[PDB]
Design a binder for this molecule. Structure first.
Ligand SMILES: *[C@@](=O)([C]S[C]C1=[C][C]=[C][C]=[C]1)[C]([C]C([O])=O)[N]C(=O)[C]1[C]C2=C3C(=[C][C]=[C]2)[C][C][C]([N]C(=O)[C]([C]C([O])=O)[N]C([C])=O)C(=O)N13
Ligand SMILES: *[C@@](=O)([C]S[C]C1=[C][C]=[C][C]=[C]1)[C]([C]C([O])=O)[N]C(=O)[C]1[C]C2=C3C(=[C][C]=[C]2)[C][C][C]([N]C(=O)[C]([C]C([O])=O)[N]C([C])=O)C(=O)N13
Lengths: 91, 140, 91, 140
């Protein structure tokens, strides 16, 4: 017998209570990074580790640009919510 | 074993809900660039052997109905389940083209005791959305 | 420059909105398991993976016992909330 | 590098807040067994080379003050920070012996721009508490 709330995983683009950013030309930062990390790592890294790579990428390589000073130069950190019980490998 | 069994005949289903346009009533701006994500995601999960199903501009009613329907499919031959939500939102909520829907209501269909064929299998939810209107100015 | 909400990690004993269980003789399920997993794995597993082991242990080996039928035979699943940007090894 | 730097002269600080007894006003039952955890945790982190500091039965005021004080210490020679909270709680809240305190208020002291010497370093919060009164009956 196991918890009915187990084996769930929520990959959030941003932290609780915060805005999430998206570029009209390339797409959201979170999705870009996620797809990219999955492309080059789905064959060797465990899922949590891939998601950790996404966190660094989004947190390091992105920064909003806006003519509006209040939405300019803002950052973002994705949020991993794991309730998994086993490691996840796509291979 | 300390890793899920991913050798079922089918990798699993992957639903992508791509909301780009919203009713004036909601007051949400058009989500430009979301199509790139939808296209990107679709290609990425196809290479991972997931059966991808893309959906665009759904109302909160349609989203709930769809999830309900998907939770009722038989996943016995499937290894996992992946659902990507592209839309607006606030903490604990995601928007349908016509208004807010609680995130709890969508996932509850996949609980261990609600969707028996997915019990013991990984259920991944990827959410691209606002969880509030707070701004991270950065440091260092 | 990085997000001010980055490099945080919240290891929750239970899922959101749920009770967390504790045994008056041995301590809470979550802490027992966490300390145990850290004892035998801090020297080789990355932190997320250690926490995943905790999830399985708590979800598989524990089940409440109560004379009160309503609090009897209940389960629990810990919740990992990661906003880390790098892998964590205690060695 | 894809892993934190854990070779600083000091592994870091580890605060354990162990709340076992509560004022009648709160209406919370005594937390029997929490001492075992506190003792267990203390020993586990000492072997990991953490400077452990145990605290028992603190009021919400004391908890906030303590965190504030700890956030003001200089962590430049430290690799990380670990804070264990043993107590009662509900979603987003943890109890001091004399009443509820928002979890946001405690961690905010350690944000990148508030505690400069911990910027870029892992801050771990381990919470043993209730996040509600919902019951998981289990399945399969
Ligand atoms: C959120 O959904 C916003 S929720 C707002 C809200 C909801 C309920 C109650 C009150 C408020 C979205 C995420 C999403 O759609 O994927 N975030 C945004 O839309 C953010 C924050 C914001 C934006 C804009 C205007 C005001 C606030 C519009 C565009 C903006 N992006 C950019 O400026 C980018 C930045 C970059 O990449 O450098 N630049 C370009 C040229 O596209 C934006 O993402 N959002
Ligand atoms: C929570 O803090 C409870 S929050 C309750 C609340 C708060 C605010 C508003 C409304 C309600 C704690 C976690 C903690 O302290 O670490 N959970 C409990 O105390 C749980 C749930 C519960 C318990 C008890 C009575 C009613 C609800 C008392 C003892 C119980 N443990 C046991 O029965 C164990 C089970 C086992 O190990 O098999 N048995 C023994 C012999 O100890 C318990 O943990 N809680």
């Amino acid at each position: 017998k196991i918890p009915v709330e187990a084996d769930f995983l929520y990959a959030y683009s941003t932290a609780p209570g915060y805005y999430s950013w998206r570029n009209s030309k390339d797409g959201s930062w979170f999705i870009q990074s996620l797809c990219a990390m999955l492309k080059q790592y789905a064959d060797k890294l465990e899922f949590m580790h891939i998601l950790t790579r996404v966190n660094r990428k989004v947190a390091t390589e992105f920064e909003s640009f806006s003519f509006d000073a209040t939405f300019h130069a803002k950052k973002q950190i994705p949020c991993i919510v794991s309730m998994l019980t086993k490691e996840l490998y796509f291979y | 074993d300390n890793s899920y069994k991913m050798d079922y005949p089918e990798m699993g289903l992957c639903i992508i809900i791509n909301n780009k346009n919203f009713h004036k009533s909601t007051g949400m701006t058009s989500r430009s660039g979301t199509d790139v994500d939808a296209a990107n995601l679709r290609e990425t999960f196809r290479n991972l052997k997931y059966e991808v199903r893309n959906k665009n501009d759904l109302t909160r009613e349609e989203i709930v109905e769809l999830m309900r329907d998907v939770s009722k499919e038989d996943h016995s031959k499937r290894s996992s389940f992946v659902c990507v939500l592209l839309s607006h939102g606030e903490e604990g909520i995601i928007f349908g083209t016509n208004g807010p829907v609680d995130l709890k209501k969508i996932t509850n269909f996949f609980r261990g005791d609600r969707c028996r064929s997915l019990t013991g299998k990984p259920k991944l939810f990827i959410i691209q959305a606002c969880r509030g209107t707070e701004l991270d100015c950065g440091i260092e």
